[PDB]
């Protein structure tokens, strides 16, 4: 803990001295960019276990959604095939009555 605290302090010592030279040369842009990079390195600490729980929970809900949706896919597929068959059979019977009644008309 103390070792890296001192390491960070020395890192900022170098940062400040580099900014010193960059000010002497009016080159504050290099200090700005180096501060950008140091910020980026020290961007992301914690946010990780919590994100992991969130992702796992959404994964669980997503898996259950997949399971149910597959259930309804099979159900709808079977039902609508059955309805197509039944419509074909109803067409069959209506043709039968039509043709027989017309034959007896003949």
């Amino acid at each position: 803990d103390a070792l890296k605290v001192k390491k960070d302090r020395i890192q900022f010592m170098a940062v400040i001295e580099q900014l010193i030279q960059m000010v002497q040369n009016n080159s504050l842009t290099k200090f700005q960019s180096m501060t950008t990079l140091e910020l980026e390195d020290q961007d992301r600490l914690r946010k990780l276990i919590f994100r992991e729980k969130e992702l796992y929970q959404e994964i669980k809900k997503l898996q259950f959604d997949r399971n149910q949706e597959n259930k309804e896919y099979d159900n709808e597929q079977k039902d609508t095939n059955l309805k197509i068959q039944n419509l074909k059979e109803r067409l069959l019977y209506k043709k039968a009555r039509a043709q027989l009644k017309n034959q007896y008309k003949e």
Binding site: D1, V5, I16, T36, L39, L45, R46, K47
Partner: protein
């Protein structure tokens, strides 16, 4: 020979000169470094919110903030502004009040 064929003609007319359209290429507003650093500075600060830091860590942060405040005080005390105190009375551009 009573066919009513209406086939396509051979109209010569050229595609006359193309006008000088209004190529108003909008200049995208580049984000400032302060704007660029807003989100990611806040990201760095969020993890630190509630973070216990060592005594030397707090000393380092205090030195950083002291440097920042002194730099801002310099910004407001640039040589151009300070030199106007060479002659306060004669510096009419400096408010007497």
């Amino acid at each position: 020979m009573q066919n009513l064929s209406k086939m396509q003609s051979r109209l010569h007319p050229r595609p006359e000169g193309e006008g000088g359209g209004g190529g108003g290429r909008t200049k995208e507003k580049g984000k400032s470094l302060q704007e660029t650093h807003k989100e990611m500075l806040k990201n760095i600060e969020s993890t630190n919110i509630g973070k216990p830091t060592i005594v030397e860590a707090q000393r380092i942060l205090k030195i950083i903030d002291n440097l920042s405040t002194n730099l801002t005080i310099f910004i407001y005390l640039d040589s151009e502004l300070i030199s106007k105190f060479l002659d306060v009375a004669k510096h009419s551009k400096l408010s007497k009040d």
